[PDB]
Paper text:
Here, we reveal the extended and contracted atomic structures of an intact contractile-tailed phage (φCD508) that binds to and penetrates the protective S-layer of the Gram-positive human pathogen Clostridioides difficile.
Thus, there is a 5–12-fold symmetry mismatch between the capsid and the portal.
Residue numbers in the entry:
A (entry chain C), B (entry chain D), C (entry chain E): 19 to 382, 389 to 469
Write the structure that this text describes.
Amino acid sequence: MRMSSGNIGVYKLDDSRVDYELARELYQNKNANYKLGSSFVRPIVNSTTGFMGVPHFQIEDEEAQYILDEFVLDNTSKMLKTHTDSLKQGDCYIWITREERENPLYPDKKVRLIYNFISPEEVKEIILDPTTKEPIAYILESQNEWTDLGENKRKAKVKQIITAESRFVEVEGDKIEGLEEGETPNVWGFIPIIHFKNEADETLKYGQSDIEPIEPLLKAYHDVMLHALKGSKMHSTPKLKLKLTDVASFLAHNFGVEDPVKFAKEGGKINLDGHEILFLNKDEEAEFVEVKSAIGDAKELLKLLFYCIVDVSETPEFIFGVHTPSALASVKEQMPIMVNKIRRKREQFTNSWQLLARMVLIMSKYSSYDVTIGWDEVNPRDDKELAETLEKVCCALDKALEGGFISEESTVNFLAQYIDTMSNYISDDPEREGEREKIIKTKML
Amino acid sequence: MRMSSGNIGVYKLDDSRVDYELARELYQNKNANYKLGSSFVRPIVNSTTGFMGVPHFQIEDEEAQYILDEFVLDNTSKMLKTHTDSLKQGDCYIWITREERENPLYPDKKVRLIYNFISPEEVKEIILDPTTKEPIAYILESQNEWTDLGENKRKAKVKQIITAESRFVEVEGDKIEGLEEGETPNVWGFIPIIHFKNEADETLKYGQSDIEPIEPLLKAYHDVMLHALKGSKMHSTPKLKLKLTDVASFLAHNFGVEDPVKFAKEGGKINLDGHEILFLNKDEEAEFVEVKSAIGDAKELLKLLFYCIVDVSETPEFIFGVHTPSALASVKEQMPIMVNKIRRKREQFTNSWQLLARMVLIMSKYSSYDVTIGWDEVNPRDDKELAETLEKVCCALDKALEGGFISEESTVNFLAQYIDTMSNYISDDPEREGEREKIIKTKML
Amino acid sequence: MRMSSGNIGVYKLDDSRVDYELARELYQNKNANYKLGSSFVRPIVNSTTGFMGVPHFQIEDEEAQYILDEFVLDNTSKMLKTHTDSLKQGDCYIWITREERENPLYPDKKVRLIYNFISPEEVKEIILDPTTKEPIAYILESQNEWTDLGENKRKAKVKQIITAESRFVEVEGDKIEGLEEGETPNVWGFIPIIHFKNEADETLKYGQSDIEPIEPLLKAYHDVMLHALKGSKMHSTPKLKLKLTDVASFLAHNFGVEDPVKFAKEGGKINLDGHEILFLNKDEEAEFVEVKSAIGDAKELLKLLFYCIVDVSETPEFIFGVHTPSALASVKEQMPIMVNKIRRKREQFTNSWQLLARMVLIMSKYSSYDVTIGWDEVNPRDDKELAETLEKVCCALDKALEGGFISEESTVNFLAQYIDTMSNYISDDPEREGEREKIIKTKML
């Protein structure tokens, strides 16, 4: 809708948050006000996060590439879980910490970088530079209830400030052995936390969940389904109606109910086997009071709400093929829509992955720190087709000999692409198999 | 749903558990409150477990690879059962123990590593390091009722603390020969227990079952089915209605029921053959009191609940194609959805398998310990197609001769992939056939 | 459902059993309370058993391989029967015994190993080591009623205690000709009994049948079908209704029933031919009292219960193609689901088969005892396709000559696989044809 040039309020950044507990309950189908309606949350979020896969850190420096190779080999699962958490809860925070912890379970790796998650409820507040809107302090706070290895219950409320200059931690309650209260300087001059933000908007300080667009539709679906279920429970089973000359004597004789008022008060149930035969007087009548449909048009409304949910989430129909069996027959025909959705979705996180890879490289001399992110194939290419186009390129070259060296450049680049695309396995996240094969090849030769 | 920046409680870790008894009863279809509804639990969990297969331990060191080869050859079945238990009960605990005991059933194996399951109810409490959340003690407790090899019944309530420094065990009852009470030092400086955690969440101490998202839907499905069955039992069979001048005389003459009150009180049943003929005087009337539908709209509600269950579990429709025969015609078309789901599910456990392999290597010098996890083919590739693309690669090479030395690297890597993918059998979990073929080839040559 | 960290009872091993008599009656369709419903037990169990086939014992030691070859040649039928018994009854026990008894029917075999079945009801109790939960004594007991070769009936209650050190047997009643009472030491220091356990669970001492998940659904199906049959018998045939001026006079004149009360009491039947014609007064009326449907919605309920049974058992729909004719058109499209089910199921028994083969080798020096279990093809590969990929591999090699010496290692392994896969016949369980072809080839040359 339009408005005049004037008559508009002053811009202000919105610092509202996603209510992460409700988002997790909806995802896990736990919230009693959405139980029948929140069935759609899991397929949407999980299909979106599974098809988008995990990033592929590409950097021209070989040492930086080795560092990122080791990092992805250690943390591909957590990298996928980051996408899942960002899509579900709106915000996900990743804390990179370097530990020199010696323990006999890790004799190979003396020093490690840990891919720690900060739960979005731990982040009490984010202090932003007003100009650049980049963080200058993270306020983390949590309640730690833990039993000691003896018999003592322990409780400790720990809060901490993480800033570029230093990090400060203070705790009230039982002492934590692994924490040192007070300020401690930051080994690097940047905050080691990466803020992954789903559906990042310039006007919002925090991200938005994929559940938020569908949440009113989920509530409406739950309401319609619950009303339908209650109505069917009340009215689907027909009610036998007996118009009798004397009700009380009929009850006393047939069912032994000498006191029908007391019987109704105590919740007594008349027992029936289903094979009864009715003997009645001339005047007495028996009929079934029955509904044509206890649900009526609720099914159409649920269908319309399902259509609205599918529209909002932009999920391809094969993800919900049980509702629409047509989609199940042409999934490869549906794949362009999924590819478009994943193309749009991957750009939200790729800058955060650039930041994460840059921080990992800095935390461990290199000639470059900018990292380009590849991704898993949403619509995988057959190896046979790739080899076919390779053969076509090769036979097309070695002819029209005035081409020059660009033929060599094109074919060597194509082989570089081909090896990477062939080695990466379709049904496995990340390129860990590529690194494994390369390392085994280098060692065994 | 949105909320203000403030007005949020302090973060606290959730230590709730999955109620493993109910999960097993629902899986086995035993719980009386879910019998008609819990039919869906088995296909979901078992399809997800069968299609995700078992891990393939890959490590560059040949001795470590041999150790892991022997381990998988021994314990592939238990590795699959680990996935089944994690998906069903939410939590599964694997205890690795080294046994030097000699018995004549195993003369080949002087020393063995045992893949022991700790039932999730045995784990009374897990003591976590508050900072890293690394487990520092496991509180195992169980009630051991066992018959003696003689005639005596025996009973003992065994509890034990498993810690990195040592393990402490105490018993309350009939003393057990195989257990030594008191502290005994731990040969390795880590707790040799792997906590497999289905649907691991940062905010939860324990895992989540795949039954939890569908559980309210299973309960609703059971309620609808049971109400439908009871209504059909009571009302599906039409009730013959006789409007008579004198009911008691009719009963006394036709059926010999000269005391209808006593007859109804004692539960007497009038006997009919089905070929009756009704002779009535002019005033009397006979009619069937009949329902148009004793079930009404319960079938539509069950269809909707089935759709919701399929959505929540994200099961591909061909798993439940008896409901929807359309899916059964295009299973290969629907396989990519299963591939996506199995990718996402496999990423949950792979870190635990890396930990397990690392512990196994440590519990039995090696230049590397970072094991990498391969997996079974969700949608297998045909061997002929792999050979065709290999032929295409081979013919593409040896032409455009400025490609360089990387052609040999690419082709030898493809051969290494090809032999591995061919030797592994589709219809058999794990790569045990690969190891056995390699060993037989090495011995017989 | 969720629960608190506390508020849970102590873990205890469940020693309940499967009620094997009821399981066999359900399989054989004998139990009176399941006759109409237990039709589904046979196709489920028998399809699962037939498709899973029998193990293939593979060991690199040629002498051990020969021993296992002879064993499977003798006992493949009993190996399949073991799977059938385990799936049906939950438990199945195999007792390996070595017999030196000479008889003229076996002049070729001085010494034999017998594959005996212990019926699961014979096993009165299993004494388990409390720590390892391995058996240390089997309590077998049975009532032996047998006729003497003369005219005498004989009865004897024989119980025995099979332990690792010795087996003790004591018998009441008539003297058994072939049994010696009292203790006798074991020639080997292990109990030669293999406990095959279908759906083995860590919390259950004994196995559990595939009938247990479906049993309540079978009962519900039987109840619905029986109620439908009784209702149809009572009410399907319409009841002719005559509204007469004088009923008794009509009966006496037409059907000669001078005493209708005595006629009804004695169960007399009025005889009709079907071609009657009714002559009536003005006031008299005749009408058919008829039901619109004596079954009502029981057909929908039986369909829903059939769907639930198919879901629980996870059987592919082509096993029940008579219900769903769609499945009959695309069995080869359905076969991946069967392959998945059999993949999951085979892991339950493969460890037991490894134990059995280990015992057989020990009960008859060898350099290895670990046996790898192959299996029949659930979805067989065409020989022509295998040969096609063979020639593709062969032509792919011998080119790009820098591949090295691993080409021979790959192709010899491929030929070893090809010979085994070709010789094994699809429509015959086990590899007995393979062993016999090998033996005939070696003998005739």
